[PDB]
């Protein structure tokens with residue numbers, strides 16, 4: 412398993428395809444793609460524990476955390492509502508204990524302040540992360 | 545005990561939830577749930593290789609086979625178009641080489657004749673599918 416993909420969907424217009432690639436076991440995972448239908452600005456971007464969409468994104472459960480492992484920061488939507496995603500992350504994995512295959516990728520309503528807010532709302536869209544060609 | 549779950553959806557009315565449970569890594573996998581929106585009768589029931597929903601059920605690629613590993617026989621819909629599923633399989637797994645987590649469960653248009661259709665000389669289109677996810 413060196414490649415994965417996730418199709419994000421929700422009750423609103425938020426949708427996108429997010430690719431994952433990890434060329435070396437235990438190596439960094441590159442995450443890239445595009446999300447549209449977002450409000451301009453920052454949106455929390457997280458892997459949640461369960462790849463369970465039985466009740467929409469709510470059944471994905473909590474932030475994945477065997478920074479939390481699943482915490483992928485924010486994505487940034489432009490004035491057109493489009494977020495172009497290009498991240499490299501050394502904590503998530505496509506195998507082993509930190510493997511995110513079969514878990515859920517979520518884009519949030521609000522910005523994640525990363526715990527540095529000086530003193531991220533609903534789940535707009537999600538999908539199960541699957542093995543890709 | 546590993547647990548997995550799959551929500552099936554597709555281009556038409558076919559929808560369902562299928563659960564997986566495997567008590568030990570070398571034990572059988574119980575598969576159970578229900579699918580609705582089906583024509584009465586048999587429908588091929590397969591794990592396909594890729595958990596890729598970029599193109600409906602088509603991007604799932606081929607039948608999973610590292611009978612084929614992904615071949616889970618057929619499911620049987622009743623007169624209400626509902627197939628109640630309860631299967632035990634000792635070839636698929638929720639870990640290791642035959643792991644189906646991150647792959648795609650597919651329910652087909654037609655029966656899979658299981659290679660016993662009587663003409664050595666077929667499941668048809670994919671009605672619904674879902675990526676198989678880790679469950680609580």
Ligand SMILES: [Zn+2]
Pocket residue numbers: 455456457459474517519
């Ligand atoms: Zn989150």
Ligand SMILES: [Zn+2]
Pocket residue numbers: 588589590592607650652667
């Ligand atoms: Zn098939």
